[model samples]
Target: RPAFCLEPPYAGPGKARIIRYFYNAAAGAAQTFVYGGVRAKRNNFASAADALAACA
Candidate 1:
């Protein structure tokens, strides 16, 4: 398994807005699971696993 972790302190409203914009842009470019708020984990791996399993 591969994982990427990002830690940013959204100190104020302006910073939060910027972060949200970046998340939207990343998702627009086909980057998956660029979510806001708190969550247990990131990304969606069901299709990736299915594709790999098909190869086997």
Candidate 2:
């Protein structure tokens, strides 16, 4: 689970309320990206649901 990563949320011009999180276990760091819409910085997300909720 540490080596594998999660998939990013679907992002598009119309569907901007999508988000994703990917973690690098080796570095113990994370990166989040939003495409085709507004951008975002890293956040405090507890789960996948949290990531989605914060975007909207």
Candidate 3:
């Protein structure tokens, strides 16, 4: 599990929706989930704000 701040469960393009936004302080990484619980997008950011912002 990852820290949740700007997590999303709202509708998005097509059938995909913003599911989870991960901000791991230890790993210094961020991840996100789309529709059908599909997880693919992952990145590293200086702050949780940049993480979620990029996800958007």
Candidate 4:
């Protein structure tokens, strides 16, 4: 098994962000699912959203 990177599109406040995980069968390998996101601090939804959006 090998490690792979997945970046998902970020959704703003009041929106839902969907992240999908997959396996690279062609490479004959599999990887673990890893997801991360930024939190809204100081009511900075825009900033958080921007940061989250960069995940992709």
TM accuracy, model 3: 0.26
List runs of model 3 lying over 4 Å from the truth.
1-42
Candidate 3: tens digits of C-alpha lDDT, residues 1-56? 34343443322345544455455445555654343334443443435567756643
**Residue-level lDDT tens digits of model 2 in 3-56:** 133434334455464445544334445545454444433442435455444442
Worst 10 residues of 1 by lDDT: 15-24
Question: What's the true lDDT of residue 9 in model 3?
Answer: 35
lDDT of 4 by residue, 1-56 (tens): 21221322223343334342333334432322323334322212233333333322
* TM-score of each prediction: 0.17, 0.26, 0.26, 0.19
Most accurate candidate by lDDT: 3
Ranking by TM-score: 2, 3, 4, 1
Query: In candidate 1, which residue pairs get closer than 3 Å at backbone N, Cα or C atoms, i.e. clash?
Result: none
lDDT at 39 for candidate 4?
38
Model 4 per-residue lDDT at 24: 30
In model 1, the runs with Cα more than 4 Å from the true position are: 1-46
